[PDB]
Write a protein that binds this ligand. Structure first.
Ligand SMILES: Cc1nc(-c2ccc(C(=O)O)s2)cs1
Length: 283
């Protein structure tokens, strides 16, 4: 496994940060005029990244189409993903209008609501069956239908209504619940267990809209979920599977959203995720 020799090289030489900065240095910088404007400044989780203007998801409202989210389109792999900030209290309604307008089936959440003592997002889904949520500003109802609580994650069925017209759709919320406060998980096994369960739902498949995933600054794990999925997929696609170069794939994703993969631990972990996984894919 070549990636693996290069991986092991790197390990022995203590080069993560140095490879990491290199990618940072060659990354893509694109304008983000929209995020940065006065009116839409209440709409951004702070500290947070900015959606480039060429890639941003447009809301279908005629007065502020703004949301902190991006479309990542991977031509080779035939995968698209929407990456976004954990919603704020003032943007919960926005988040669900995006999910509706974009025909998504799944939402993936890679963090806890509260971490390291602070709120990392607003509690954006109903906690109980009997108590649904109404977002008057975007005219939408959200009802919890079922909950499946497992050892590392939890999966939920949701029913979202478009109150203007009466349509309803099922949305599945996949939540990874055991990403440690500090660092990265030792083994990627649960992480890969989790990615295939999402795959299995149909939420990443071309017959649905793009999967919405949330990455919130100081903690932007989602980059890894996408990076990992795209490489594995390409390994199943090409003739020469050893030609998949995660660095290159990463930079490619970076043309669409700034700063995906937040650290050298996270890059290392990304290699790990893939190597295993590939290995499991061999049997
Ligand atoms: C059939 C599959 N092959 C791979 C890989 C095979 C070999 C690799 C390598 O040696 O680098 S990656 C992943 S899934």
């Amino acid at each position: 496994m070549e990636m693996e020799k290069e991986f092991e090289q790197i390990d022995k030489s203590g080069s993560w940060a140095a490879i990491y900065q290199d990618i940072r240095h060659e990354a893509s910088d694109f304008p983000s005029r929209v995020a940065k404007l006065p009116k839409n400044k209440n709409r951004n989780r702070y500290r947070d990244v900015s959606p480039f203007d060429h890639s941003r998801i447009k809301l279908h409202q005629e007065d502020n189409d703004y949301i902190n989210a991006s479309l990542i389109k991977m031509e080779e792999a035939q995968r698209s993903y929407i990456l976004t900030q954990g919603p704020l209290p003032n943007t919960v309604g926005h988040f669900w209008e995006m999910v509706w307008e974009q025909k998504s089936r799944g939402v993936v959440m890679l963090n806890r609501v509260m971490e390291k003592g602070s709120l990392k997002c607003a509690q954006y889904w109903p906690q109980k069956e009997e108590k649904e949520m109404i977002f008057e500003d975007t005219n939408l109802k959200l009802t919890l239908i079922s909950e499946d609580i497992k050892s590392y994650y939890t999966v939920r069925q949701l029913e979202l209504e478009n109150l203007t017209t009466q349509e309803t759709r099922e949305i599945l919320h996949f939540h990874y619940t055991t990403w440690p406060d500090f660092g990265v998980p030792e083994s990627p096994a649960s992480f890969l267990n989790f990615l295939f369960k999402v795959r299995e739902s149909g939420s990443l498949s071309p017959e649905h809209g793009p999967v919405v995933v949330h990455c919130s600054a100081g903690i932007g794990r989602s980059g890894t979920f996408c990076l990992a999925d795209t490489c594995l997929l390409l390994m199943d696609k090409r003739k020469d599977p050893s030609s998949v170069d995660i660095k290159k794939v990463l930079l490619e994703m970076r043309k669409f959203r700034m700063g995906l993969i937040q650290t050298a631990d996270q890059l290392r972990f990304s290699y790990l995720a893939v190597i295993e996984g590939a290995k499991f894919i061999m049997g």
